[PDB]
Design a protein around this ligand. Structure first.
Ligand code: MG
Ligand code: MG
Ligand code: MG
Ligand code: MG
Ligand code: MG
Ligand code: MG
Lengths: 213, 136, 217
RNA sequence: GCCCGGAUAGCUCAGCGUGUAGAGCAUCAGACUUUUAAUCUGAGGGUCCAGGGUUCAAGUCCCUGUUCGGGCGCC
RNA sequence: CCCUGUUGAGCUUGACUCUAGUCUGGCACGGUGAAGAGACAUGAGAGGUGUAGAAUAAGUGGGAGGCCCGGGCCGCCGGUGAAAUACCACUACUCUGAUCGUUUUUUCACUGACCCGGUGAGGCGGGGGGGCGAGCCGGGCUCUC
RNA sequence: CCGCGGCGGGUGUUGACGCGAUGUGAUUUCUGCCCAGUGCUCUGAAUGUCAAAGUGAAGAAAUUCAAUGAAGCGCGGGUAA
């Protein structure tokens, strides 16, 4: 017989400080009424935020995910949790009469998160090509996923979590594999399709705050 | 029912979930987490005939009520997650979609981003039905 | 539902509740009535409550009587201001006229003598047993001595199925010294016409036209 | 002995104090080029028995004629 | 063997009258703290359809003109029904809620009675020093350690 | 499961591949239909009947009358190696 929506407070959620826009939106929590804590039932919340509403002029077919970790009061602070690829894009990129290449590898950064990274690469039809197939071999595939496993670890073993984001806001890896695999067989549609965090470290409090200035 | 914002400065976002079967149609408006909900109404609550649980007019009679229950609480913009039945079963969203989206966009909201969240399996199990299949 | 000068729950003495001239919310004459609530007296039972009490103070209603009779009461009361009439007034008042501007009606008190008992319950029975003008043995109809009383301030009262009694007692136009001889005979005979049970007098009102009650003791 | 519910057309059977419903049998027709199956009207009703009070009773109360639950027991 | 006796034993169950055990209620030993579910009492607001009829006249007992401003809207007689609606109420029914009492209330809570397990009754809780190491704006030490 | 009894005792120095209570009788082969009855069990305020106690009223009181009313039988589902 009572409306329970006046028993709530709206909070805000922020981003780390290598992006542009800080605000994401508002998320209501119950008051701390007796035992249950409004910081507690809000802290474990995940925000699916597309990158073109986090930047000014970048692509829109990439998404990030941001959990919450700490309560400041009308302020949640967020950390990187993973990256997704839109079903618009991936299904608008897989088409017949071309060859699909996938890969996946695990890596631990210098402070430790156990990132799992996936990838994909499609072969490109040439300019004057009249042969319809444009298939690859199998030894040229295995000599391609050897390079993608060499590169994701090589770009990741020697830095922290703050700088691989700056190596994922552009397409700097897909550019690199496209130009270090153009020698064997010319591929055009290269992405890292999912980055997943496995095992987060100890909750040190102000490495985040360093990520908020 | 409270609001801390200013109108034209920003748009307060929520998010909906447009479930669309061949016999029933959900609309479930939640928040950015999805964990916290706002309102939920089905097609089946409004029409007293189970052979048109999912008529397109039965989504309009509930979508107008959702945007009517939400304007008292202060939401201007919505994201959309569209969703079929999914799985090993069919994957075509039924007819209760394209007249319920227009039905609330016409009813005065600010439509944001549009995507698909239909649960496509990588490798299905066996669908219910024989090798000769449901024949009739 | 209200009356601004007198409160209903205060119990004024038998002369202090004659403060009723302050009830004048209406120009005309109020029908001062009574709504008493009998308690522990079931109207379902064989225990009857239908009788007469002659008051004094001529409460000024208008009275129209159709006495019916075939006796020596034709040569006993035909000078005493009543339209007494023979069986031609039964052929007349039989409800053949349910029609325009005239009815076999418009008489506040009928009569059944012992010679016309197999007529007025026969001829005018379903037409007079429901408006109340049906004569009987607890409605006190011999009307050789009591018909002048049915002219006077005599009144009749009977039981009701929702556990009450309604009867007219006065009119708020008269003086207080006549309303005290309406209060004495009003509170006197309900105990004797009420039989031995849970307490008798519970909810006594004074009523009017657009009015509210006021309780006494 | 205490309390309790039950009886309506030829079988099962509806009834919302202001009117006797229904399904299945028996007839006569219609639909089909002709049989089957389905379609519709019609015939049958004393609302288990007497009273009540009510404007109005199948309907609430009352008892008697018929079936049944249950707890009880000093001639 | 068969019968009789007002003679008995062993067994069985729907024989008659009783019993250990077990199921359920009540009173006690038996305390300390908050929330919630009622039994209504005083007393508040809402509604009613065979039509007839100024409506949906649920039933009151009358009243024969007020009401509201000498003026205007309505009769009780009509208009028409089983009772008539101008004229105020009381009395029912159920719905809803405040109310104080009423009261029978159920889950969460503490530890001290009581009960259980373990040990040769062997390192408990706070607070310190020492450590991974830190909001590092080093420091008061922070969840584990 | 024992026992007149208690913080009593066996199964038990045991723990579901284990204790305890039953009907059939090797293997091969098959094991049919019936849940109305007598049993058994489950949903029970979905309620007709249902003590003591604690409650209300009338009485000078002993008393008398009312509300409420646990299990189980009743009513409703499941079960034939
Ligand atoms: Mg024929
Ligand atoms: Mg003998
Ligand atoms: Mg013997
Ligand atoms: Mg026996
Ligand atoms: Mg066996
Ligand atoms: Mg059986």
């Amino acid at each position: 017989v009572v409306d329970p929506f006046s028993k709530k407070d709206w909070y805000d959620v922020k981003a780390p400080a290598m992006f542009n826009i800080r605000n994401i939106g508002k998320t209501l929590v119950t008051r701390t009424q007796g035992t249950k804590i409004a910081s507690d039932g809000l802290k474990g919340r995940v925000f699916e935020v597309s990158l073109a509403d986090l930047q000014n002029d970048e692509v829109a077919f990439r998404k990030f995910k941001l959990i919450t970790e700490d309560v400041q009061g009308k302020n949640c602070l967020t950390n990187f949790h993973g990256m997704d690829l839109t079903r618009d894009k991936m299904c608008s990129m897989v088409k017949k009469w071309q060859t699909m290449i996938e890969a996946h590898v695990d890596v631990k950064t210098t402070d430790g998160y156990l990132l799992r990274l996936f990838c994909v690469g499609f072969t490109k039809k040439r300019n004057n090509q009249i042969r319809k197939t444009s298939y690859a071999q199998h030894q040229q595939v295995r000599q391609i996923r050897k390079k993608m496993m060499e590169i994701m670890t090589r770009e990741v073993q020697t830095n922290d979590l703050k700088e691989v984001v700056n190596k994922l806001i552009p397409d700097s890896i897909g550019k690199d594999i496209e130009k270090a695999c153009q020698s064997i067989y010319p591929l055009h549609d290269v992405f890292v399709r999912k980055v997943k965090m496995l095992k987060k470290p100890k909750f040190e409090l102000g490495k985040l705050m360093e990520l908020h200035g | 029912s409270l609001g801390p914002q200013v109108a034209e400065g920003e748009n307060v976002f929520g998010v909906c979930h447009i479930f669309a079967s061949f016999n029933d149609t959900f609309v479930h408006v939640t928040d950015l987490s999805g964990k916290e909900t706002i309102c939920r109404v089905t097609g089946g609550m409004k029409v007293k005939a189970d052979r048109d649980e999912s008529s397109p007019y039965a989504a309009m009679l509930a979508a107008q009520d959702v945007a009517q229950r939400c304007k008292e609480l202060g939401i201007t913009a919505l994201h959309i997650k569209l969703r079929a039945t999914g799985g090993n079963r069919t994957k075509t969203p039924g007819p209760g979609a394209q007249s319920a989206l227009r039905a609330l966009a016409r009813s005065g909201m600010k439509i944001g981003r549009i995507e698909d969240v239909t649960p496509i399996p990588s490798d299905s199990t066996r669908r219910k039905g024989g090798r000769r299949g449901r024949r009739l | 539902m209200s009356s601004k000068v007198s409160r209903d729950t205060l119990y004024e003495a038998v002369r202090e509740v004659l403060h009723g001239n302050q009830r004048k919310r209406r120009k005309f004459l109020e029908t001062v009535e009574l709504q008493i609530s009998l308690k522990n007296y079931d109207p379902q039972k064989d225990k009857r409550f239908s009788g007469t009490v002659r008051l004094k103070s001529t409460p000024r209603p208008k009275f129209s009587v159709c006495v019916l009779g075939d006796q020596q009461h034709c040569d006993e009361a035909k000078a005493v201001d009543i339209p007494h009439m023979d069986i031609e007034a039964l052929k007349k008042l039989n409800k053949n006229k349910k029609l325009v501007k005239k009815l076999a009606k418009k008489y506040d008190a009928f009569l059944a003598s012992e010679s016309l008992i197999k007529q007025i319950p026969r001829i005018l029975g379903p037409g007079l047993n429901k408006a109340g003008k049906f004569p009987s043995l607890l409605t006190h109809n011999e009307n050789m001595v009591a018909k002048v009383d049915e002219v006077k301030s005599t009144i009749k009262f009977q039981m009701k199925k929702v556990l009450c009694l309604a009867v007219a007692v006065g009119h708020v136009k008269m003086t207080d010294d006549e309303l005290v001889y309406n209060i004495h005979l009003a509170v006197n005979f309900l105990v004797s016409l009420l039989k031995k049970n849970w307490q008798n007098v519970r909810a006594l009102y004074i009523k009017s036209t657009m009015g509210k009650p006021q309780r006494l003791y």
